[PDB]
Symmetry: C3
Subunit: 341 residues, 3 copies
């Protein structure tokens, strides 16, 4: 096989921000924006070859392809070469992290890049990435399957390759999943002895502007629920923790945050209504409570399946971030269209 595949998806999104700091017009409310936005259109090529006696060569080259013409690049979405057989699957390339894959049971929503935090559960997803790495995925044995994945030191920091003067940013990713009669539970996590975070607590490249070096960077996620008989329910808990590793007054002090998320949906023929809620508890930053990181959000919407490949989509979200006067409120809604090929 060699298959061309992808998804074209886009819609009209309407959004308003409430922020006393950045806007002054009527209680810190911004104007209402209305935008045509691509929702993350993508195109890939992939294939497999039977190598004889169980084993297959596998490969994939997947690309961002926004119908707004803003992307460029090959292989900037999940892309790999690997082998598959009775042993499971081994791949190397630009790979989804185990946590990024588990996000499929957390964030079912479609939106443009501008609305990812309010028309989707974007905040809980901040830990998810693609990385140049090697990954093993097991076969499914008695309901159970698992993954392990590694990003080498010299891929996490190319510059330092021959002069190991910077602490390693290598990382480990692992997951375990169980499925039985519609019921599912999964753990997914990561560890990096050293890492770097921006102020949104996303991992960024070493030496990025305003990056914060951290040590013992760990992320744990558990997701459980039910997906069968027209019903979908998902509940997720997530925990992120690190020590400050920046040279200065606060080195050694602990960062941490807990997030939770829940989704329910029910299929009525070709219509799926869906509701999501998510909450970020106050973070500990340099060992001190920081309510700037707390958030609450709800999203409601529905998908209308014209076919198995084509859906019309609608949603509305409300998000509140922080506390008091630095507080930010986002509201948004969209209508859209998705076509898989």
């Amino acid at each position: 096989q060699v298959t061309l595949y992808g998804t074209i998806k886009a819609g009209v999104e309407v959004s308003r921000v409430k922020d006393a700091g950045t806007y002054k017009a009527q209680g810190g409310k911004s104007k209402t924006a209305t935008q045509i936005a691509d929702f993350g259109s993508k195109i890939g090529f992939k294939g497999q070859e039977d190598l004889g006696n169980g084993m297959k060569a596998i490969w994939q080259l997947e690309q961002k392809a926004s119908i707004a013409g803003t992307n460029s690049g090959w292989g900037n979405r999940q892309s790999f070469i690997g082998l598959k057989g009775g042993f499971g699957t081994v791949r190397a390339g630009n790979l989804n992290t185990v946590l990024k894959d588990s996000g499929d049971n957390v964030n079912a929503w479609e939106s443009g890049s501008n609305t990812e935090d309010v028309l989707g559960l974007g905040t809980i997803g901040r830990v998810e990435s693609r990385e140049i790495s090697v990954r093993y995925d097991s076969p499914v044995f008695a309901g159970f399957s698992g993954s392990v994945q590694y990003v080498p030191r010299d891929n996490a920091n190319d510059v330092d390759k021959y002069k190991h003067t910077k602490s390693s940013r290598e990382s480990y990713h692992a997951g375990l999943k169980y499925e039985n009669a519609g019921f599912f539970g999964q753990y997914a996590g990561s560890f990096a002895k050293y890492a770097d975070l921006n102020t949104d607590a996303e991992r960024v490249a070493v030496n990025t502007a305003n990056a914060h070096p951290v040590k013992d960077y760990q992320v744990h996620r558990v997701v459980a629920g039910y997906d069968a008989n027209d019903l979908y329910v998902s509940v997720a808990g997530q925990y992120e923790a690190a020590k400050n590793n920046e040279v200065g007054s606060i080195k050694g002090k602990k960062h941490e945050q807990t997030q939770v998320a829940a989704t329910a949906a029910y299929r009525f023929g070709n219509v799926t209504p869906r509701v999501s809620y998510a909450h970020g508890f106050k973070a500990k930053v340099n060992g001190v409570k920081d309510a700037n990181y707390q958030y609450d959000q709800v999203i409601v919407g529905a998908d209308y399946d014209f076919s198995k490949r084509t859906s019309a989509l609608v949603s509305a979200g409300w998000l509140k971030q922080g506390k008091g006067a630095g507080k930010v409120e986002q509201t948004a809604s969209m209508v859209g269209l998705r076509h898989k090929f």
Copy 2:
């Protein structure tokens, strides 16, 4: 369906510029340049899905692909998702403007980017663009069809999305076409309450360097002719008008220019000879006649069809711009090859 399609096209172009201002060697004549040039090679992917009872989902992802290796990007040519049925066609994405589509009956010529104004009718085409927009196209009823298209404020100016401090650059595009027994007539136009022009009178993005803000920016084009029985004839008139909207002495003053174009071609078996003429009358700039905008051009050439997909091409053009001493004359010729797949 999912179809791969495109056109590979390129040739050798020979060109000379006469410009007393920029060249001094022998009456302001430049040296003669000879270049291999891609003519606008492109590749796309597209598809459709019957949704039951008349309606279809449609999508397209088209890209610039120069065989000289100078392009990068997905979806930087006409790209969309939409629906089609008895109601007509609705699309959203990076869409040809109605005026850009009408250009098919104005500029039949192929050339590289360097020769677009002399080996093609590039000046009349300066009003044509692709825009992130929504568009409706009607069915053909008794010879008649039409289009309407809109570019939202927050797509024309993303930066200003939440602070509507800049006047809207939203625009409307519309067209009407009639066809009967080889005869065709079409109107295509656009209006933008506010817009921005460079000195070549092309629309550029707000806040571009040396952009000129304008108000009441309107473009009207009429094209009429005959296309049947081996004969092609086309005549076009175009009118562009705007008011100066730049803070300063000349705010409120009128810009305007009229252009006309005509083409004839006749098919003799596999050979098509073609001739084009175009003229830009003196522009009004800040309410004052500006002969720097006037131009006259002729192009002659032929296409040699090896097949329905493969043509060899030859052309020669002469263009004169401006008047007196700021005057510019361009001459050029090419030979080339075009293959559609």
Copy 3:
């Protein structure tokens, strides 16, 4: 026909540099680097159309596509339009140079960009490029075939197109090949009356930072050997020469260098062991011996063919550059996987 094709290839590479100048830790040895690296994954589209009575239109659009997601661009590998028939083949576009094609019988090794000089015979290949050009390839007549290729002045230097104030960087490329019963011999070469080299003696664009202008830039390569009955042997000699053309004390003085390369491999069923050796003799730079350019290298490895399209790969290389204290030693090894589609 319209065919999608390509090769996905990548592996894990381990490398160490010995350089007293840039490293100080234990006799100028660097740390050992271990990296997942793409080996030059690529994807193309190509086609042909019978034009009647022997002739065919041909075209190709080939792209770099690294599964690490670092490439962007269309047509940045061999890409063209052309015609083919009894006369041979004519193409125009981003074309392999005749010398670049002859490199197929010189460098059989796969590696990432970081290891090209030690896990491949990269130094001898420094003369190889793709150029926007026109090329003719003859049919094979009684074992003999040949190529001629030209890069025009205004493609080698676009800026200067209309003001021929800079000496032409146009170039000629030519080759001749003979094949008989497994035995092969080929000459490939190039001439450019004027050119520009960086300090690694690679051709760079005019006006590049630290480019060195040269005159009478010639490259000659002869490759001979045997490729049949499970046995492969190749021997190559290469000669490069130019005159300094930089305004200053040393203008007119001669640069030159000779390189040689040899490879043997034998197929044992699905396993091919291979060995390569290459040597660069002391260069003459500005008429003076420069041992900084001398080098010696060996590579050993094997390919394991799972199928005709899928190979596992292993190699190890040792390279020594220069002499004395400016001396550089590189060691490396890899394991990898290659899949052609």
